Amino acid sequence: EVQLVESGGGLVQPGGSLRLSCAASEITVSRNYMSWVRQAPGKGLEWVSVMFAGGSTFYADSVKGRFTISRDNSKNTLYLQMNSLRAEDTAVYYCARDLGVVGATDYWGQGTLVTVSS
Amino acid sequence: EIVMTQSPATLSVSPGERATLSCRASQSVSSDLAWYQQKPGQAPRLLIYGASTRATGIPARFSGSGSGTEFTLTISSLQSEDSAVYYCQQYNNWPPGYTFGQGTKLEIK
Amino acid sequence: NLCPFDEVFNATRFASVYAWNRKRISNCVADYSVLYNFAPFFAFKCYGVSPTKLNDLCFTNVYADSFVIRGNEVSQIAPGQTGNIADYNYKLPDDFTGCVIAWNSNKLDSKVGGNYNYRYRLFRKSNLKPFERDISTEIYQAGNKPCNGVAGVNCYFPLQSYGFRPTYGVGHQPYRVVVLSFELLHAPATVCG
Numbered sequence: 001e002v003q004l005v006e007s008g009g010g011l012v013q014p015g016g017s018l019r020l021s022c023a024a025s026e027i028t029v030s031r032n033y034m035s036w037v038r039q040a041p042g043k044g045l046e047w048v049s050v051m052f053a054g055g056s057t058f059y060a061d062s063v064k065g066r067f068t069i070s071r072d073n074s075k076n077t078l079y080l081q082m083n084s085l086r087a088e089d090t091a092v093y094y095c096a097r098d099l100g101v102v103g104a105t106d107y108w109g110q111g112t113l114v115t116v117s118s
Numbered sequence: 119e120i121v122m123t124q125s126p127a128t129l130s131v132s133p134g135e136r137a138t139l140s141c142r143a144s145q146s147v148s149s150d151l152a153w154y155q156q157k158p159g160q161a162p163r164l165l166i167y168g169a170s171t172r173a174t175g176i177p178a179r180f181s182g183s184g185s186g187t188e189f190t191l192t193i194s195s196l197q198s199e200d201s202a203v204y205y206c207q208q209y210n211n212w213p214p215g216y217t218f219g220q221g222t223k224l225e226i227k
Numbered sequence: 228n229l230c231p232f233d234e235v236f237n238a239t240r241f242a243s244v245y246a247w248n249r250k251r252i253s254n255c256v257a258d259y260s261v262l263y264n265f266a267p268f269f270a271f272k273c274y275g276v277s278p279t280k281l282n283d284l285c286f287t288n289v290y291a292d293s294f295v296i297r298g299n300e301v302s303q304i305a306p307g308q309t310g311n312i313a314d315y316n317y318k319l320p321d322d323f324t325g326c327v328i329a330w331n332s333n334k335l336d337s338k339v340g341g342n343y344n345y346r347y348r349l350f351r352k353s354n355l356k357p358f359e360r361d362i363s364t365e366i367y368q369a370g371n372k373p374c375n376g377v378a379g380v381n382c383y384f385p386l387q388s389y390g391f392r393p394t395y396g397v398g399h400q401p402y403r404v405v406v407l408s409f410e411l412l413h414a415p416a417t418v419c420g
Contacts (some may be wrong), residue, residue, distance in 0.1 A: 002380075047216040101212070
């Protein structure tokens, strides 16, 4: 069925790097506005990053300059490289395909936990 | 950076009655909004997009309303499984932008 | 012998950022006394040429490109600037010398019924080449068929209305924008005075 499945979730020591990956089915991502969201345990949600259909990507300010989104279009998948994970970035990350005024964000990912050593 | 404030924080209503949840904006959000129901344990689920348009499949028991800086979601008859958390997401700036709320916990009796 | 720039900016018929409007000016004396000196202009800015020097500057031909955008997106009309309107709708080159001007039309073009007659572009397959008119009527989709035979999934239409109405805040008040491009290749330059 149409879906987004995630991988890369785990634990890493502060300052370390990590890479989250998102695979899709029955729907394309290369031509779909993709958006990674995250949730801190117990808190609300916050938009982390977005990549367009032409390649021009964008990131939130809280993570600006540190995270970089990319996607293997050839096999229909998305990726997000993170580095220098500090104490804040421990959260569950979701993958999403947002249309906007013509259908607000709808298809989401099972999520993936990302915690740090402490 | 428009800050959204949900209300009330919690709500416990007897089964079978109506339920009313308010979400308040700080600037003009016209009719650009959405409501997500994140049943505890997995990803959220879209209920109502734009101003009050009911997402496909979504049971008619839900109804959205409001415009400008104030919006409201209303549930006709809560069934046992309606207990979940709900969030109002605004999107007046679409490419790249979204701003979430604090969420609301709804239970039954 | 003055050019018709006056009309160009005051014709108050501007079409859309979708398939913008153009004019090829030639053989006249470009005054400029009013250009960027009239009162209700909100933003005017050129790169490579100073306004007064420009007023003494001279060229081979002129290209005027008028269109209408949302106020919060005027910052995206710039050399290589990245966003939506400047990536899939209308994209100006990197070495573009010349100036743009933008007016807050929060009164002249808006109606309570929704002055959304114009439908801007929100679904494109690949980025734009500079000055590539891409007015088109197709159905952006995901699966096999377009919306002619499918509905809901893979039923997208790139032309979305704006919905300009007065309750909208400044960030959503329709700004009218006009961009001037002076070409200097083989210039038996016919325009200065």
